[PDB]
Amino acid sequence: AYTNSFTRGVYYPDKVFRSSVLHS
Amino acid sequence: VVVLSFELLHAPATVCGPKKSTNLVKNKCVNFNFNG
């Protein structure tokens, strides 16, 4: 063997565009 | 018995009903109906 994935795996959750905003 | 199920906003709309489209004007407050 295992190894740690530091911050990998982040993807755009939906096709809807956003910019300069935090979204939960 | 036929059952029809629809999906909204999952993806760009691929199936649509027949409505004639028109040219889009800009810079003027106008009704817009884009892809439903």
Side-chain angles (χ1 to χ4, degrees):
Chain A
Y2 300 166
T3 298
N4 64 63
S5 66
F6 277 88
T7 62
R8 305 279 93 187
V10 173
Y11 65 99
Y12 297 83
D14 185 18
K15 290 280 223 172
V16 173
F17 169 82
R18 299 168 178 87
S19 189
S20 316
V21 71
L22 323 179
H23 197 74
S24 89
Chain B
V1 167
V2 167
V3 163
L4 302 175
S5 303
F6 313 109
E7 185 148 19
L8 302 93
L9 199 40
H10 204 79
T14 68
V15 58
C16 281
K19 284 323 302 173
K20 300 288 98 176
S21 88
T22 81
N23 189 316
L24 64 89
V25 60
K26 314 173 185 281
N27 302 68
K28 199 284 181 191
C29 181
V30 297
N31 297 115
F32 57 80
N33 176 5
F34 293 178
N35 285 326

Coordinates of all heavy atoms in Angstrom, one line a residue, unseen atoms left out:
Chain A
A1 CA 2.4 -2.8 -0.9 C 1.6 -1.5 -1.0 O 1.8 -0.7 -2.0 CB 3.2 -3.0 -2.2
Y2 N 0.8 -1.2 0.0 CA 0.0 0.0 0.0 C 0.9 1.3 0.0 O 2.1 1.2 0.3 CB -0.9 0.0 1.2 CG -1.9 -1.1 1.3 CD1 -2.6 -1.4 2.5 CD2 -2.1 -2.0 0.2 CE1 -3.4 -2.4 2.6 CE2 -3.0 -3.0 0.3 CZ -3.7 -3.3 1.5 OH -4.5 -4.3 1.6
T3 N 0.2 2.4 -0.3 CA 0.9 3.7 -0.1 C -0.2 4.8 0.0 O -1.3 4.6 -0.4 CB 1.8 4.0 -1.3 OG1 2.9 3.0 -1.3 CG2 2.5 5.3 -1.1
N4 N 0.2 5.9 0.6 CA -0.8 6.9 0.9 C -1.0 7.8 -0.3 O 0.0 8.1 -1.0 CB -0.3 7.8 2.1 CG 1.0 8.5 1.9 OD1 1.1 9.4 1.0 ND2 2.0 8.1 2.7
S5 N -2.2 8.2 -0.6 CA -2.6 9.1 -1.6 C -2.7 10.5 -1.0 O -3.7 10.7 -0.3 CB -3.8 8.7 -2.4 OG -4.9 8.7 -1.5
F6 N -1.8 11.4 -1.2 CA -1.7 12.6 -0.5 C -3.0 13.4 -0.7 O -3.7 13.7 0.3 CB -0.5 13.5 -0.9 CG 0.8 13.1 -0.3 CD1 1.6 12.1 -0.8 CD2 1.2 13.7 0.9 CE1 2.8 11.7 -0.1 CE2 2.3 13.4 1.5 CZ 3.1 12.4 1.0
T7 N -3.3 13.9 -1.9 CA -4.5 14.7 -2.2 C -5.1 14.2 -3.5 O -6.0 15.0 -4.0 CB -4.2 16.2 -2.2 OG1 -3.3 16.5 -3.3 CG2 -3.6 16.7 -0.9
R8 N -4.7 13.1 -4.0 CA -5.2 12.7 -5.4 C -6.7 12.3 -5.3 O -7.2 12.1 -4.2 CB -4.4 11.5 -5.9 CG -2.9 11.8 -5.9 CD -2.5 12.5 -7.2 NE -2.5 14.0 -6.9 CZ -2.3 14.9 -7.9 NH1 -2.1 14.5 -9.1 NH2 -2.2 16.2 -7.6
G9 N -7.3 12.3 -6.5 CA -8.7 11.8 -6.6 C -9.7 12.9 -6.7 O -10.9 12.5 -6.7
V10 N -9.3 14.2 -6.6 CA -10.3 15.2 -6.7 C -10.8 15.4 -8.1 O -10.0 15.6 -9.0 CB -9.7 16.5 -6.1 CG1 -10.7 17.7 -6.3 CG2 -9.4 16.3 -4.6
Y11 N -12.1 15.5 -8.3 CA -12.7 15.6 -9.6 C -13.9 16.6 -9.5 O -14.4 16.9 -8.5 CB -13.1 14.3 -10.2 CG -14.2 13.6 -9.5 CD1 -15.5 13.7 -9.9 CD2 -13.9 12.9 -8.3 CE1 -16.5 13.0 -9.2 CE2 -14.9 12.2 -7.7 CZ -16.2 12.3 -8.1 OH -17.2 11.7 -7.4
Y12 N -14.3 17.1 -10.7 CA -15.5 18.0 -10.7 C -16.7 17.2 -10.5 O -17.1 16.3 -11.3 CB -15.5 18.7 -12.1 CG -14.3 19.6 -12.3 CD1 -13.1 19.0 -12.8 CD2 -14.3 20.9 -12.1 CE1 -12.0 19.8 -13.0 CE2 -13.3 21.7 -12.3 CZ -12.1 21.2 -12.8 OH -11.0 22.0 -13.0
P13 N -17.5 17.4 -9.4 CA -18.6 16.6 -9.1 C -19.8 16.7 -10.1 O -20.5 15.7 -10.2 CB -19.0 17.1 -7.7 CG -18.6 18.5 -7.7 CD -17.4 18.6 -8.5
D14 N -19.9 17.8 -10.8 CA -21.0 18.0 -11.7 C -20.6 18.9 -12.8 O -19.7 19.7 -12.7 CB -22.3 18.6 -10.9 CG -23.5 18.7 -11.8 OD1 -23.5 18.0 -12.9 OD2 -24.4 19.4 -11.5
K15 N -21.3 18.8 -13.9 CA -21.0 19.5 -15.1 C -21.2 21.0 -14.9 O -20.7 21.8 -15.7 CB -21.9 19.1 -16.3 CG -21.6 17.7 -16.8 CD -20.4 17.7 -17.7 CE -20.6 16.8 -18.9 NZ -19.6 16.9 -20.0
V16 N -22.0 21.4 -13.9 CA -22.3 22.8 -13.7 C -21.0 23.6 -13.3 O -20.2 23.2 -12.5 CB -23.3 23.0 -12.6 CG1 -23.5 24.4 -12.2 CG2 -24.6 22.4 -13.0
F17 N -20.8 24.7 -14.0 CA -19.6 25.5 -13.8 C -19.7 26.4 -12.6 O -20.8 27.0 -12.3 CB -19.3 26.4 -15.1 CG -18.3 27.4 -14.9 CD1 -16.9 27.1 -15.0 CD2 -18.6 28.7 -14.6 CE1 -16.0 28.0 -14.8 CE2 -17.6 29.7 -14.4 CZ -16.3 29.3 -14.5
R18 N -18.6 26.6 -11.9 CA -18.5 27.6 -10.8 C -17.1 28.2 -10.9 O -16.2 27.7 -11.5 CB -18.8 27.0 -9.5 CG -20.2 26.4 -9.3 CD -20.3 25.5 -8.1 NE -21.6 25.0 -7.9 CZ -22.0 23.9 -8.4 NH1 -21.2 23.1 -9.2 NH2 -23.3 23.4 -8.2
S19 N -17.0 29.4 -10.3 CA -15.7 30.1 -10.3 C -15.6 31.0 -9.1 O -16.5 31.7 -8.7 CB -15.5 30.9 -11.6 OG -14.2 31.4 -11.7
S20 N -14.4 31.0 -8.5 CA -14.1 31.9 -7.4 C -15.1 31.8 -6.2 O -15.4 32.8 -5.6 CB -14.0 33.3 -7.9 OG -13.3 33.4 -9.1
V21 N -15.5 30.5 -6.0 CA -16.4 30.3 -4.9 C -16.1 28.9 -4.3 O -15.7 28.0 -4.9 CB -17.9 30.3 -5.4 CG1 -18.2 29.1 -6.3 CG2 -18.9 30.4 -4.3
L22 N -16.4 28.8 -3.0 CA -16.3 27.5 -2.3 C -17.6 26.8 -2.3 O -18.7 27.5 -2.1 CB -15.8 27.8 -0.8 CG -14.8 28.9 -0.5 CD1 -14.5 29.0 0.9 CD2 -13.6 28.6 -1.3
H23 N -17.6 25.6 -2.6 CA -18.8 24.8 -2.8 C -18.7 23.5 -2.0 O -17.7 22.7 -2.2 CB -19.1 24.5 -4.2 CG -20.6 24.1 -4.5 ND1 -21.6 25.0 -4.5 CD2 -21.1 22.9 -4.8 CE1 -22.7 24.3 -4.7 NE2 -22.5 23.1 -4.9
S24 N -19.7 23.2 -1.2 CA -19.7 22.0 -0.4 C -20.6 21.0 -1.1 O -21.8 21.2 -1.3 CB -20.3 22.3 1.0 OG -21.7 22.2 1.1
Chain B
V1 N -48.5 -2.3 -21.2 CA -48.3 -1.1 -20.4 C -46.9 -0.5 -20.6 O -45.9 -1.2 -20.3 CB -48.6 -1.3 -18.9 CG1 -48.0 -0.2 -18.0 CG2 -50.0 -1.6 -18.7
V2 N -46.8 0.7 -21.1 CA -45.5 1.3 -21.4 C -45.3 2.4 -20.4 O -46.1 3.3 -20.2 CB -45.4 1.8 -22.8 CG1 -44.2 2.7 -23.0 CG2 -45.4 0.7 -23.8
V3 N -44.1 2.4 -19.7 CA -43.7 3.4 -18.7 C -42.5 4.2 -19.3 O -41.5 3.6 -19.7 CB -43.4 2.7 -17.4 CG1 -42.6 3.7 -16.5 CG2 -44.6 2.2 -16.7
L4 N -42.7 5.5 -19.2 CA -41.6 6.4 -19.7 C -41.0 7.1 -18.5 O -41.7 7.7 -17.7 CB -42.1 7.4 -20.7 CG -42.8 6.8 -22.0 CD1 -43.4 7.9 -22.8 CD2 -41.8 6.0 -22.7
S5 N -39.7 7.1 -18.4 CA -39.0 7.7 -17.3 C -38.0 8.7 -17.9 O -37.3 8.4 -18.8 CB -38.2 6.7 -16.4 OG -39.1 5.7 -15.9
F6 N -38.0 10.0 -17.3 CA -37.1 11.0 -17.8 C -36.1 11.4 -16.7 O -36.3 11.2 -15.5 CB -37.9 12.3 -18.1 CG -39.1 12.0 -19.0 CD1 -40.4 12.2 -18.4 CD2 -39.0 11.7 -20.3 CE1 -41.5 11.9 -19.2 CE2 -40.1 11.5 -21.1 CZ -41.4 11.6 -20.5
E7 N -35.0 11.9 -17.2 CA -33.9 12.4 -16.4 C -33.6 13.9 -16.7 O -33.4 14.2 -17.9 CB -32.6 11.5 -16.5 CG -31.5 11.9 -15.6 CD -30.7 10.7 -15.2 OE1 -30.8 9.6 -15.9 OE2 -30.0 10.7 -14.2
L8 N -33.5 14.7 -15.7 CA -33.2 16.1 -15.8 C -31.9 16.5 -15.2 O -31.6 16.1 -14.1 CB -34.3 17.0 -15.2 CG -35.7 16.8 -15.7 CD1 -36.5 15.8 -14.9 CD2 -36.5 18.1 -15.8
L9 N -31.1 17.3 -16.0 CA -29.9 17.9 -15.5 C -28.7 17.0 -15.3 O -27.7 17.4 -14.8 CB -30.1 18.8 -14.3 CG -29.1 19.9 -13.9 CD1 -28.7 20.6 -15.2 CD2 -29.8 20.9 -13.0
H10 N -28.9 15.7 -15.6 CA -27.8 14.7 -15.4 C -26.7 15.0 -16.4 O -25.5 14.8 -16.1 CB -28.3 13.3 -15.6 CG -27.5 12.3 -14.9 ND1 -27.5 12.1 -13.5 CD2 -26.5 11.4 -15.4 CE1 -26.6 11.1 -13.2 NE2 -26.0 10.7 -14.3
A11 N -27.1 15.5 -17.6 CA -26.2 15.6 -18.7 C -26.8 16.6 -19.7 O -27.9 17.1 -19.5 CB -25.9 14.3 -19.4
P12 N -26.1 17.0 -20.8 CA -26.8 17.9 -21.8 C -27.9 17.1 -22.4 O -27.8 15.9 -22.7 CB -25.7 18.1 -22.8 CG -24.6 17.0 -22.6 CD -24.7 16.8 -21.1
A13 N -29.1 17.8 -22.5 CA -30.3 17.2 -23.0 C -30.1 16.7 -24.4 O -29.7 17.4 -25.3 CB -31.4 18.2 -23.0
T14 N -30.4 15.4 -24.6 CA -30.3 14.8 -25.9 C -31.6 14.5 -26.6 O -31.7 14.5 -27.8 CB -29.5 13.4 -25.8 OG1 -30.3 12.5 -25.1 CG2 -28.2 13.6 -25.1
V15 N -32.7 14.3 -25.9 CA -34.0 14.1 -26.4 C -34.8 15.3 -26.1 O -34.8 15.8 -25.0 CB -34.7 12.8 -25.8 CG1 -34.7 12.9 -24.3 CG2 -36.1 12.7 -26.4
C16 N -35.5 15.9 -27.1 CA -36.2 17.1 -27.0 C -37.5 16.9 -27.8 O -37.6 16.1 -28.7 CB -35.5 18.3 -27.5 SG -34.3 18.9 -26.3
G17 N -38.5 17.7 -27.4 CA -39.7 17.8 -28.2 C -39.6 18.8 -29.4 O -38.6 19.6 -29.4
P18 N -40.4 18.7 -30.4 CA -40.3 19.5 -31.5 C -40.8 20.9 -31.3 O -42.0 21.2 -31.2 CB -41.2 18.8 -32.6 CG -42.2 18.1 -31.8 CD -41.6 17.7 -30.5
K19 N -39.9 21.9 -31.1 CA -40.2 23.3 -31.0 C -39.2 24.0 -31.9 O -38.0 23.8 -31.8 CB -40.1 23.8 -29.6 CG -41.3 23.4 -28.7 CD -42.7 23.5 -29.3 CE -43.0 24.8 -30.0 NZ -44.3 24.7 -30.7
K20 N -39.7 24.9 -32.8 CA -38.8 25.6 -33.7 C -37.9 26.6 -33.0 O -38.4 27.4 -32.2 CB -39.6 26.3 -34.8 CG -40.5 25.3 -35.6 CD -39.7 24.5 -36.6 CE -39.4 23.1 -36.0 NZ -38.7 22.2 -37.0
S21 N -36.6 26.5 -33.2 CA -35.7 27.4 -32.6 C -35.6 28.7 -33.4 O -35.9 28.7 -34.6 CB -34.3 26.8 -32.4 OG -33.5 27.0 -33.6
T22 N -35.1 29.8 -32.8 CA -35.0 31.1 -33.4 C -33.6 31.6 -33.1 O -32.9 31.1 -32.2 CB -36.0 32.1 -32.9 OG1 -35.6 32.7 -31.7 CG2 -37.4 31.5 -32.8
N23 N -33.1 32.6 -33.9 CA -31.8 33.2 -33.6 C -31.8 33.9 -32.3 O -32.9 34.5 -31.9 CB -31.5 34.2 -34.8 CG -30.1 34.7 -34.7 OD1 -29.6 35.1 -33.7 ND2 -29.4 34.7 -35.9
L24 N -30.7 33.9 -31.6 CA -30.6 34.6 -30.3 C -30.1 36.0 -30.5 O -29.0 36.2 -31.1 CB -29.6 33.8 -29.4 CG -28.2 33.5 -29.7 CD1 -27.3 34.7 -29.1 CD2 -27.7 32.2 -29.2
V25 N -30.8 37.0 -29.9 CA -30.4 38.3 -29.9 C -29.6 38.6 -28.6 O -29.7 37.8 -27.6 CB -31.6 39.3 -30.0 CG1 -32.6 39.1 -28.8 CG2 -31.2 40.8 -30.1
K26 N -28.7 39.6 -28.6 CA -27.9 39.9 -27.5 C -28.1 41.4 -27.1 O -28.5 42.2 -27.9 CB -26.4 39.6 -27.8 CG -26.1 38.3 -28.5 CD -24.6 38.2 -28.9 CE -24.4 37.0 -29.7 NZ -24.2 35.8 -28.8
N27 N -27.8 41.7 -25.8 CA -27.8 43.0 -25.2 C -29.1 43.6 -25.0 O -29.3 44.8 -24.7 CB -26.9 44.0 -26.0 CG -25.5 43.5 -26.2 OD1 -25.2 42.5 -26.9 ND2 -24.5 44.2 -25.6
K28 N -30.2 42.8 -25.2 CA -31.6 43.2 -25.0 C -32.3 42.2 -24.0 O -32.1 41.0 -24.3 CB -32.3 43.4 -26.3 CG -33.6 44.3 -26.2 CD -34.8 43.6 -25.6 CE -36.0 44.5 -25.6 NZ -37.1 43.9 -24.8
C29 N -33.0 42.7 -23.0 CA -33.7 41.9 -22.1 C -34.8 41.1 -22.9 O -35.8 41.7 -23.4 CB -34.3 42.7 -21.0 SG -35.3 41.8 -19.7
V30 N -34.6 39.8 -23.0 CA -35.4 38.9 -23.8 C -35.7 37.6 -23.0 O -34.9 37.2 -22.2 CB -34.8 38.6 -25.2 CG1 -34.6 39.9 -26.0 CG2 -33.5 37.9 -25.0
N31 N -36.8 37.0 -23.3 CA -37.1 35.6 -22.8 C -36.0 34.7 -23.4 O -35.7 34.8 -24.6 CB -38.5 35.2 -23.1 CG -39.5 36.0 -22.5 OD1 -40.3 36.7 -23.1 ND2 -39.6 35.9 -21.2
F32 N -35.5 33.8 -22.6 CA -34.6 32.7 -23.1 C -35.1 31.4 -22.7 O -35.5 31.2 -21.5 CB -33.2 33.0 -22.7 CG -33.0 33.1 -21.2 CD1 -32.9 32.0 -20.4 CD2 -32.8 34.3 -20.6 CE1 -32.7 32.1 -19.0 CE2 -32.6 34.4 -19.2 CZ -32.6 33.3 -18.4
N33 N -35.2 30.4 -23.6 CA -35.5 29.1 -23.3 C -34.4 28.2 -23.9 O -34.5 27.8 -25.1 CB -36.9 28.7 -23.8 CG -37.3 27.3 -23.7 OD1 -36.5 26.5 -23.0 ND2 -38.4 26.9 -24.2
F34 N -33.4 27.9 -23.2 CA -32.3 27.1 -23.7 C -32.4 25.7 -23.2 O -32.4 25.5 -22.0 CB -30.9 27.7 -23.2 CG -30.6 29.0 -23.8 CD1 -29.4 29.7 -23.5 CD2 -31.4 29.6 -24.8 CE1 -29.1 30.9 -24.1 CE2 -31.1 30.8 -25.3 CZ -29.9 31.5 -25.0
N35 N -32.6 24.8 -24.1 CA -32.6 23.4 -23.8 C -33.7 23.0 -22.7 O -33.5 22.1 -21.9 CB -31.3 22.8 -23.4 CG -30.3 22.7 -24.6 OD1 -30.8 22.4 -25.7 ND2 -29.0 22.9 -24.4
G36 N -34.7 23.8 -22.7 CA -35.8 23.6 -21.8 C -35.8 24.4 -20.5 O -36.7 24.3 -19.6

